[PDB]
């Protein structure tokens, strides 16, 4: 799980150039910073960027 | 050479089946029988799985045959899945 | 082994929840098969017009209870209780009434409506 600085309705996350995995699902992501208006799962890739 | 071992396995299986039939007759009519101690210990125990209770032993495992266990649920498993990589 | 219906601790149950793939989820009327250990679930589904076939390869049903019942086993949601007949039961204990299904983050506990789109 990536490092976070704010949890709740709005989340901010930081990522590195390594794959992150959670319960039953492993995903690949690139380094960067993402901001979401909802508490949904967020990773840095084209699928989530769309 | 291996025929003796096969016959020994068959005879052990026949004796285990006889003990299972005795246990069925117990559940129908009582009963003080062979597998009573294992079931009495397991019912009061907190071990939800038979693997940690019998430690892989065969007669202990087949004494508990026919009873409910946590291992019988396939829906509790979660196969690890790798999502699609890119475009 | 064949699943059996028990009525112990029936007065302590407010509702029922479904466990699918090791993760608790809400119940829908369009689903067709469940693994059930309760008889009142038939009345729960019938009042909503549902029907189902019992099988072991289908999501399990667990009941939300207001009383601390059973003991915690690592890797399993909720609590596990074993009946006097040897059959096991599953429940979802809670501390406050406003509880649905709760998943664990490394730091805090946050409720969710769908495991696939949550911080779980």
Swiss-Prot record, chain A:
Recorded topology in the membrane: Multi-pass membrane protein
Result of changing residue 17 to N: In strain: Theta/P.3
Domain of life: Viruses
Subcellular localization: Host endoplasmic reticulum membrane
Described purpose of this protein according to its UniProt entry: Plays a role in the formation and maintenance of double membrane vesicles (DMVs) replication organelles. DMVs are formed by nsp3 and nsp4, while nsp6 zippers ER membranes and connects to lipid droplets.
Quaternary structure note: Interacts with PL-PRO and nsp6.
Record-given protein name: Non-structural protein 4
Organism: Severe acute respiratory syndrome coronavirus 2
Taxon lineage: Viruses, Riboviria, Orthornavirae, Pisuviricota, Pisoniviricetes
């Amino acid at each position: 799980f990536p490092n976070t600085y704010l949890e709740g309705s709005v989340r901010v996350v930081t990522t590195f150039d390594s794959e992150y995995c959670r319960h039953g699902t492993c995903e690949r992501s690139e380094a960067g910073v993402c901001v979401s208006t909802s508490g949904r799962w967020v990773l840095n890739n084209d699928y989530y960027r769309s | 050479i291996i025929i003796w071992f096969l016959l020994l396995s068959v005879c052990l299986g026949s004796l285990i089946y006889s003990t299972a039939a005795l246990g069925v007759l117990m559940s129908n009519l009582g009963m003080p029988s062979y597998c009573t101690g294992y079931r009495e210990g397991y019912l009061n125990s907190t071990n939800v799985t038979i693997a940690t209770y019998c430690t892989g032993s065969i007669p202990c495992s087949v004494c508990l045959s026919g009873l409910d266990s946590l291992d019988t649920y396939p829906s509790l498993e979660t196969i690890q899945i790798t999502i699609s990589s890119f475009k | 082994h064949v699943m059996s219906k028990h009525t112990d601790f029936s007065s302590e149950i407010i509702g029922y929840k479904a466990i699918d793939g090791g993760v608790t989820r809400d119940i829908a009327s369009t689903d067709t098969c469940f693994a059930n250990k309760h008889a009142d679930f038939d009345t729960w589904f019938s009042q909503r017009g549902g029907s189902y076939t019992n099988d072991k390869a289908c999501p399990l049903i667990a009941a939300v209870i207001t009383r601390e019942v059973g003991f915690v086993v690592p890797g399993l949601p909720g609590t596990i209780l074993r009946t006097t007949n040897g059959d096991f039961l599953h429940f979802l204990p809670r501390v406050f009434s406003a509880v649905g299904n709760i998943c664990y983050t490394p730091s805090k506990l946050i409720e969710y409506t769908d495991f696939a789109t949550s911080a779980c």
